């Protein structure tokens, strides 16, 4: 359910920790993103 990291290219959730290799599970490419906080953010409508 909850995701640590997301792959940038194939947008496949990778939910990894340190020393798990910065590569993706299928395509190689290390790109990897951090995927949004579950502590929901609010904005003023102005």
């Amino acid at each position: 359910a909850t995701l640590k990291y997301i792959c940038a290219e194939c947008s496949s959730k990778l939910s990894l920790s340190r020393t798990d290799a910065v590569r993706c599970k299928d395509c190689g490419h290390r790109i990897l993103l951090k995927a949004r906080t579950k502590r929901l953010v609010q904005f003023e409508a102005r």
Binding site: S11, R36, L40, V41, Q42, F43, E44, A45, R46
Partner: protein
């Protein structure tokens, strides 16, 4: 009938063109301002974001959300959040909307103001419903989605005036004119050869009489009779944009008179 008279020329669901006979300029203008800023409306003023797989910035959308017009009919039977006693908001002071959107189709899936849906209880009062003047019944494109582009928001709309943010503006543009033939000499028309031939005559020239050359200037002449056109954005119906404009201004004057009594 009474003090200042009124003659409605043209009327619609969103435009009233009338003539304000037997008034002072100051009063006719004070009414203009009130309609612009001081009338209270309901507008989205909190956008809690859950998921935004969109090409668009959360705040871009958030700003955009407030600018959507919402039914503000029974607004006067809703407290300003700031005056209510709850921490933040409730049903007595706020209308809660919920937007869920996802691109199911291969083709671009669009998000419309119709797609917002009320989650708070309206207590049986005409409020919150987004204004849809659209022929196709969608009204206002919030944004567009691709494949798995998701958008989940919760919106809290509250009472407020346009003097705080133009989103609470119940009116579009108030057309205002007096003395079409410059008889009061409130302008000195810039010209090249003939001021009269260079400057176009307003539609209001038919509602007054041309001055006649051989007639000297009326230094005693004063401006009453103002040709106006109040346009509603949708929140409040045109008739009320005027009526509430008159009541709000009355209340402002009243507060002064009332404050003078405490002194």
């Amino acid at each position: 009938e009474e003090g200042p008279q009124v003659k409605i020329r043209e009327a619609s669901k969103d435009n009233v063109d009338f003539i304000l006979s037997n008034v002072d300029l100051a009063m006719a203008n004070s009414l203009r301002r009130v309609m612009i800023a001081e009338i209270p409306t309901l507008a989205i003023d909190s956008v809690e974001v859950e998921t935004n797989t969109t090409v668009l910035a959360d705040e871009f959308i958030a700003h955009r959300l407030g600018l959507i017009p919402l039914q503000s009919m029974d607004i006067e039977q809703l407290e300003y959040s700031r005056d209510c006693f709850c921490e933040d908001h409730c049903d007595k002071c706020s209308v809660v909307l919920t937007l869920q959107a996802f691109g199911e189709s291969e083709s671009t899936t669009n998000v419309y103001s119709k797609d917002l849906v009320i989650v708070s209880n309206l207590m049986g009062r005409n409020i919150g419903h987004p204004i849809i003047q659209d022929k196709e019944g969608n009204g206002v494109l919030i944004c567009k989605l691709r494949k798995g582009q998701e958008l989940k928001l919760t919106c809290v709309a509250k009472k407020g005036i346009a003097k705080e943010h133009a989103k609470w503006g119940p009116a579009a543009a108030i057309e205002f004119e007096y003395d079409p033939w410059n008889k009061l000499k409130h302008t000195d028309y810039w010209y090249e050869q003939d001021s009269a031939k260079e400057w176009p005559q307003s539609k209001n020239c038919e509602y007054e009489d041309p001055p006649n050359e051989g007639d000297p200037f009326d230094y005693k002449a004063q401006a009453d009779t103002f040709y106006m056109n109040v346009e509603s954005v949708g929140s409040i119906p045109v008739d009320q944009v005027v009526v509430r404009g008159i009541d709000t201004l009355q209340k402002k004057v009243a507060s002064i008179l009332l404050a003078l009594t405490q002194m």
